[PDB]
Design a protein around this nucleic acid. Sequence first.
RNA 1: UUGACCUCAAAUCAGGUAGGAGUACCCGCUGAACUUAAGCAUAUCAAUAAGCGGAGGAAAAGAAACCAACCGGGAUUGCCUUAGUAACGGCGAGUGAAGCGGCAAAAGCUCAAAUUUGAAAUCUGGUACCUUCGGUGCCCGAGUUGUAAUUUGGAGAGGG
RNA 2: GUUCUUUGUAAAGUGCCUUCGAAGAGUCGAGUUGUUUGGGAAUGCAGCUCUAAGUGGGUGGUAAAUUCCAUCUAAAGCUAA
Lengths: 203, 150, 187, 96, 94
Amino acid sequence: GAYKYLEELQRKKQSDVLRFLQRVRVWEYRQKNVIHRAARPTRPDKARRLGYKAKQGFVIYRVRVRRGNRKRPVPKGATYGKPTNQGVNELKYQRSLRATAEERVGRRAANLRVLNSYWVNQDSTYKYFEVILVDPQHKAIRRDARYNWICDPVHKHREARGLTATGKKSRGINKGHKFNNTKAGRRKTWKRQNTLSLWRYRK
Amino acid sequence: EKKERLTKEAAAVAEGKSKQDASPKPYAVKYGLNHVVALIENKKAKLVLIANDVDPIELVVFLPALCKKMGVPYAIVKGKARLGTLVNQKTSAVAALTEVRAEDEAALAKLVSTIDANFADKYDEVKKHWGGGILGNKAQAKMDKRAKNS
Amino acid sequence: PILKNHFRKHWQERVKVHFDQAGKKVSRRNARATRAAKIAPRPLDLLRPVVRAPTVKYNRKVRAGRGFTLAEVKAAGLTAAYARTIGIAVDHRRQNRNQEIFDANVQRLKEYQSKIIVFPRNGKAPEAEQVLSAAATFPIAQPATDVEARAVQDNGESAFRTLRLARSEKKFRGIREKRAREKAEAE
Amino acid sequence: VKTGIAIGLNKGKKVTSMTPAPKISYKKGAASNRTKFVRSLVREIAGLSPYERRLIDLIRNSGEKRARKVAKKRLGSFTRAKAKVEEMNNIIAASR
Amino acid sequence: VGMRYFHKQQAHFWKPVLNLDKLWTLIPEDKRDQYLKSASKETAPVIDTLAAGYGKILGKGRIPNVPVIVKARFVSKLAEEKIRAAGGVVELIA
RNA sequence: UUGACCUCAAAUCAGGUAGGAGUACCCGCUGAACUUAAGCAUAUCAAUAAGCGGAGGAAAAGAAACCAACCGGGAUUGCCUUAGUAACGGCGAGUGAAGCGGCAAAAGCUCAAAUUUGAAAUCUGGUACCUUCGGUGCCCGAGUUGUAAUUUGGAGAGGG
RNA sequence: GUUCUUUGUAAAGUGCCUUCGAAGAGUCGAGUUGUUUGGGAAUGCAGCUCUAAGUGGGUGGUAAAUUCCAUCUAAAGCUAA
């Protein structure tokens, strides 16, 4: 099948064929809106291993975000503080641009639930993403229990709490000795160890 | 026909205890894209038709290189819309034919000799040139007038 | 004396005092008693392996592990799929590379299937009067190293020069091998 | 084989070993028959990337010593530069 | 002051010491009076110093003349000499 | 000249859904200074108060790209302990984890990636009837740029 | 517990012999710049530039080269106490 040939040929992103497609498709994506509906995924293999199943109730959105840092919104660079916090242009915004891309399509299509997302194309001004969303009200999803777990109301707005694939990365949630400050969540393991525990019979 | 064929089998199964030899062997085009690519690389295909316009172009571009490798006589037909009509879909994007009836055998081998003369034989020198030198006609008249004057 | 206390933060916001210790104990025993009525013939916990601890300080002990293996369960004569229904924990990621631990867990399995009786699916359900602790029925036994008294055999190896030469051989192993190749590479 | 004393080249108790069944998730690296056929097919389609073009003009001119220094810096590390320049010797050998 | 030790863990350095003074409290109380009244090399009590939780055997006092088989990870020079005069071997266990 | 296809639209179209409130606890983002250092910029206060986004009866984490250096352990959480220790700091003031051990609770697993190819075997909707959190039968539709069945690395598949 | 309904030429499990064994990309990683905590020529995350491999890849708390050995299988996902 074309599963493996598409998997390998996408990896050669500087070959003479793909930089042709990367330069044609970057023109098309500027001419549309910031958020607009993709009728079908442009990368079908990469969509499919993330969980896309071509049936009724899986919606692909295409989104455009700004490249660059984050400039602090204080007026005229006057931070009013100890002479550290004067830094303005070097500030870097702890969430990635990928999770910012998931929130704009999330706040637009609010009935939909955002499943995952992936990279497509980039430019000096904009990065481009293509986001897979799931419809929880559609009857093909409320049945067939591979996917009825998303209709559970604890999965409301996964993209905004940081539970997606790039959400759990940016929080720094993996196993290991490196991730001590963030293994059970950062502010949970802060409050755990900055707490004076006092039993009845004092130890 | 399948809604006709199953009850035609079902009367044969209970009455005659037949092993579904009541249904003959089928011959039809094999049409799914992951199914055509699996029929190639086993050398099980006779002709592979390729639609030229596919909206994610990256899907199909390895097929003229893969059909040259395993030795299957590919063709690049025009239209994914035409290929859907012969196989009862809207769009098809490939159509491959494994087998053919024996009375129709000589008609196939004549057709393959015309197709390979255009596509599989030209494949050695298709790779050595680049397309896209066309310009707009206002720009095309601009340089032809100058080159005539120069 | 110098004394270090870390109380510069707003520490009075995060102070947890455990008045509920005597309260949570009564709630926890009612949790076990409610479970033991729901699971009414079954012994409230799964069966556990005999496992020797890591970390040179603790390797003399032996300890109840998580689950057996796929190898120890097959040696007793049952699949891993059926083993979880019997009450036997299965840990797929552990491996056996010792024999005395392997022989201890298998004998722990041969005893277990004799002590249990499994009811038929069909019915008639013989009343069995559950025993609430599977760990107390199959205790974890400390293995015995040696006998109490032996005879003295003495070879004069001096037992400290033994430790000394074993130390120096590790330290000077690498440089002596560099000498041993330079003799070999000559001419 | 451990010796049986506390310190040395082989410390620790002598116990009989079982050398158990090999885990399947150790052979993740070995490819297939099929993936070798796929990757050979994609390389002739895609062609060489632009820095790989700058290696095969550099090995033919300035030897393999300077080629590992550029391939150290375009890629990440030095041990990945061995895996790339060894591939570019296979490209020229297939050419001639 | 000295050099730094990144990632220190007190399992590498677990080694509690035992002097030759006690050496018999490891043996239980009721059997103790029998083993002190025998000079037999044929029946000598085996004391496993690791199982009681002692890393090293050090020589600090004087011990009686009964031969004793000792199992230990580490012994000093003077401790192994003082047991050898009593007629007791020191077997190294791991 | 009709008839498809692709992309893009409209309708008080058929049926649906989101916003707001609460906000003790939970997941993020953003983010100060008074204060301590007998000054102070560093550091501290603090990855905290304020501001903003999003949930539940719990949330979050979770079935190892783990800890280890052992005769080896075995998903995550919580407690006792490791420990005011290793470690970092105008090495000043100050800050400060994790692995083992005991215990509470215990539960595992699912896709992508294999041609059903001797048969898209799958699914929403519309309408009749019914034993209605649904079921059966016909008709359009989705769909071959991939919906079922089989497989998830502890394995597993194809022939015998 | 008691009662009438049998779903199945359906489904599951185990022994042996062979050929096999598909396993996630602007990602892992590196450079620099900011931010973070005990993480100490770099503990996380983020911006930009560069950008892999398949007996490979990550880690093994002092950088780099060279030779080994151990251990797990990342870049997709769910789940009570």
